Structures are given as C-alpha cells and as structure tokens.
Design a protein around this nucleic acid. Structure first.
Length: 50
RNA sequence: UACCUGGUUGAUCCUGCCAGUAGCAUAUGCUUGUCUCAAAGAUUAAGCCAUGCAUGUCUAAGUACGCACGGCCGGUACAGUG
C-alpha cells in the first residue's frame, strides 16, 4: 500500500483567508534519498577495504 | 651629587641621641586657567544588603499538522519564513 495517500488532513479554515488543507511530514518513510544514503555508506565500506 | 647642619660648656674636644634635610605613599587643609595619560570601598566590616542587569544558543544539514503569516495549484507525503 502507498502510505502517502492515507494521511489525515487538517481542514484549515479561518475567516478572510483562502481555503486551506494541511498535512504532516511523514517520518521513517523510505524515500529515494534514504536508499541513497544507505548505499553511500556501503560505498565507504568498500573504499576502506580496498 | 659617595654631602651634612642646630642643640649639653664660662670656654674646649668628644661620646651620644633629639631636631632639622630629601624622596615615596595614604589622608587632609588652602588654591586652581589650558591640554595628554591615568589610580580609584584594599586597610576598619570575607559586615549587612532594597531594585535593575550580569548566560545563553539554529544552520542547506536532529524534531514543524501553531493559517502566526503568506503561498503554490489546488488529489498533489512535507512549498517556504517560522
């Protein structure tokens, strides 16, 4: 299941302002940056062994 | 600048101190136009203390769901500043 399509929203409404919705930032979420950080530090494990 | 001078006797020469002399530090008195630098609640009481201040801190890079403000363009995980 995709996790990011299941976040609750904040129905953010105040007078005079535009209608707004707001969502939190998901933590402990596997993203293409996290997987690059993991494989970068095994590129350092190989560099030291060489 | 490696220095003495007054005072014991009727007069002398001594011993010998007292007093004078110059600086330097704290206070104090009287006086004080300019300008440069500058010590400053140590001495008595390491006594007692109203009030204020003297220690806080965020970057691209720990954690942002405060509309606090704006803001995409509007299904759009999290724009951003915070």
């Amino acid at each position: 299941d995709d996790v990011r399509q299941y976040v609750v929203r904040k129905p953010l409404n105040k007078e005079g302002k535009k209608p707004r919705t707001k969502a939190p930032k998901i933590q402990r979420l596997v993203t293409p940056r996290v997987l690059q950080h993991k494989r970068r530090r095994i590129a350092l494990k190989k560099q030291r062994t060489k």
